[PDB]
Structures are given as structure tokens and as C-alpha cells.
């Protein structure tokens, strides 16, 4: 039911990148496609999402910080509910000389990890089964 080039989970559809960008692009690039930056609202998806983005690239989900450190949100304004941060994440490395780490991303095993939004990574769109 998704387009070619999509994975269906539930009634949406996902697209995971062979494009790398940093996170303002691959933001763009999915609003392109009328989709938006992989929100995970559950472990199912998540689980699910885990097993479609193994190996060494990282893949960037709908999730910032930049309107208030510390406080992170979907791209749609939602509050992050579910989590699944690697212990020890997000620490916000470099905030000492620059505006640290504000944009999520997916790492090994599937857990979250925040990086400078300037880092090349893969991403996942989402959106809905038409
Ligand atoms: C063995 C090692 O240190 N690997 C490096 C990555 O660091 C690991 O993963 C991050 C997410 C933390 O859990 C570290 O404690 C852990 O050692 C390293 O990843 C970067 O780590 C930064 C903190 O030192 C920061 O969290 C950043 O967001 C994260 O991307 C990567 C990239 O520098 O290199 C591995 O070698
Ligand atoms: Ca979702
Ligand atoms: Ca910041
Ligand atoms: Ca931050
Ligand atoms: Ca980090």
C-alpha cells in the first residue's frame, strides 16, 4: 500500500535514506515527499524501525531540542513521550563553544544519541498509507 521504494508498518510508511544530510535537509527532504522526519511513539515501532536501519550509518528521527536545551520534541511540537536514549545520552557534547548537540538520531542497536545538527547522517521519513 506505500509507494515503491517504502516500508509499510501499521498504516504508515517509511522511508529510510541511502541520502545523507544534516538535519535541516533531511528534514527538507522529507517534507518533499509530503512525509516528515520519523516520529517513534512506541516500542513496536521502534523495534520495527531497529531492524531496518543496521549498520554503521545513523539515521535521523523528527526530534530537537534547539527551542529550549533540554527539552525535547517532535517536529510536530508533541513532547517526547516514549524514549529510547542510550544511557549516558543525550549529553549535549560541545555545549561549551557552540549550541551543542540538539538534533536525535538512531545509533547502534536502535537507541537515540544527540548529535551537532551539522552531522552528515541517513534519516526516515513517515507518513501516511493513501
Ligand atoms: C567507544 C567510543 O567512545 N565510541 C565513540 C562514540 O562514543 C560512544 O557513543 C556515544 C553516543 C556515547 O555513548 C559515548 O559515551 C560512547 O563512548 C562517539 O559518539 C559520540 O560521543 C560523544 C560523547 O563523547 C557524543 O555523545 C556524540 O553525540 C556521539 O556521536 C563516536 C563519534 O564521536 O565515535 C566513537 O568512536
Ligand atoms: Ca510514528
Ligand atoms: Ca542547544
Ligand atoms: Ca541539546
Ligand atoms: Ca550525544
Redesign the pocket.
Known amino acids: 500500500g506505500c509507494p515503491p521504494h517504502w516500508k509499510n508498518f501499521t498504516d504508515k510508511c517509511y522511508y529510510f535514506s541511502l541520502e545523507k544530510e544534516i538535519f535541516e535537509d533531511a528534514k527538507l527532504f522529507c517534507e518533499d515527499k509530503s512525509s516528515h522526519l520519523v516520529f517513534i511513539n512506541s516500542r513496536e515501532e521502534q523495534q520495527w524501525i531497529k531492524k531496518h536501519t543496521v549498520g554503521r550509518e ?1 539515521h535521523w528521527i523528527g526530534l530537537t531540542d534547539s527551542e529550549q536545551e533540554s527539552e525535547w520534541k517532535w517536529l510536530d511540537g508533541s513532547p517526547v513521550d516514549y524514549k529510547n536514549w ?6 549535549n ?1 560541545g555545549s561549551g563553544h557552540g549550541p551543542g ?1 540538539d538534533c536525535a538520531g538512531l ?2 542497536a536502535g ?1 537515540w ?4 545538527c551539522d ?1 552528515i547522517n541517513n534519516f526516515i521519513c513517515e507518513k501516511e498509507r493513501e
Request: glycine share 6%; no cysteine; net charge negative.
Open positions: 545513523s542510550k544511557a549516558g545520552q543525550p549529553d557534547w548537540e545509533i547502534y537507541q544519541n544527540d548529535f551537532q552531522e
